[PDB]
């Protein structure tokens, strides 16, 4: 259809959730409507590494350098790791073979794509199919972002 929206409340805090990926039109024409959104939640497929990851990295690069998103914070979720651990053996991460090395290399090759390091931060996470601590991570990141913005506005930071 169009844009899909969801509500959920956590720790007496209100959360608007905007799914927009189904628009299927020119992103640059309407992307500016979302200036001022507190956080951007990105999702990266790990098991789709052999190249889909080049496309995913290019898409990530574009979002960081958009002019509207100069000061917005990025929350990154790395999914499909349960299959990734087994896929390393069949397809090495070069396409020091290990789970930790591949995870660190992926994390570094993404996190090294924001020039204005001082302006914004890139929270990073590893998510599995089943985990109840994801919402706690979102809460603990959003509160930090809010505090940083309030401090920067008054000149204290």
């Amino acid at each position: 259809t169009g844009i899909v929206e969801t509500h959920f409340t956590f720790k007496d805090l209100h959360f608007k959730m905007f799914d927009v990926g189904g628009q299927r039109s020119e992103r640059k024409k309407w992307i500016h409507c979302f200036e001022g959104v507190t956080a951007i939640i990105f999702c990266v497929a790990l098991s789709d590494y052999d190249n889909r990851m080049h496309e995913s990295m290019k898409l990530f690069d574009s979002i960081c350098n958009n002019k509207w998103f100069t000061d917005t914070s990025i929350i990154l979720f790395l999914n499909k790791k349960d299959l990734f651990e087994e896929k390393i053996k069949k397809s090495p991460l070069t396409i020091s073979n290990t789970y930790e090395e591949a995870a660190a290399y992926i994390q570094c090759q993404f996190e090294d794509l924001n020039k204005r390091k001082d302006t914004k931060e890139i929270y990073t996470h590893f998510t599995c199919a089943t985990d109840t601590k994801n919402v706690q991570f979102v809460f603990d990141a959003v509160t930090d972002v809010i505090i940083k913005n309030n401090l920067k506005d008054c000149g204290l930071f």
């Binding site: 930090d144 505090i147 940083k148 401090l151 930071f157």
Partner: peptide, 19 residues
């Protein structure tokens, strides 16, 4: 103390809002 950080120890001049 603030003057101590400003003058004698410029290396430890930094601010953080998480810790």
């Amino acid at each position: 103390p603030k003057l101590h950080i400003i003058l004698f120890q410029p290396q430890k001049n930094v601010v953080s809002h998480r810790a």
